[PDB]
């Protein structure tokens, strides 16, 4: 069970970040993929996790 809990927490935190890009994004580099898709909002949170 703990394996699944860990795996789910990744995408939980990823979406919890994604809410920030929806509602309080910074002065991002214009047109840059720092205006993350869902994909990048996974990719950062997984890449930092390994």
């Amino acid at each position: 069970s703990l394996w699944a809990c860990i795996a789910g927490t990744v995408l939980l935190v990823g979406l919890l970040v994604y809410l920030l890009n929806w509602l309080n994004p910074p002065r991002l580099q214009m047109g840059s993929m720092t205006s993350t898709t869902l994909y990048n909002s996974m990719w950062f949170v997984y890449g930092s996790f390994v």
Binding site: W43, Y46, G47, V50
Partner: protein, 49 residues
């Protein structure tokens, strides 16, 4: 682990890399764990007394 982020942009490669890394980290942790076992089993036993 030295390489850092990989610049590719294609789904099939990133989807492979996501498993590749989770192979590497497991194997590294297995190595350190077994070496610690080996070292703690060592340095105890002898009996010619």
């Amino acid at each position: 682990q030295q390489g850092g982020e990989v610049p590719y942009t294609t789904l099939a490669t990133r989807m492979m890399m996501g498993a590749w890394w989770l192979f590497a980290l497991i194997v590294i942790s297995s190595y350190t764990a077994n070496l610690a076992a080996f070292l703690t089993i060592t340095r105890i036993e002898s009996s010619i007394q």
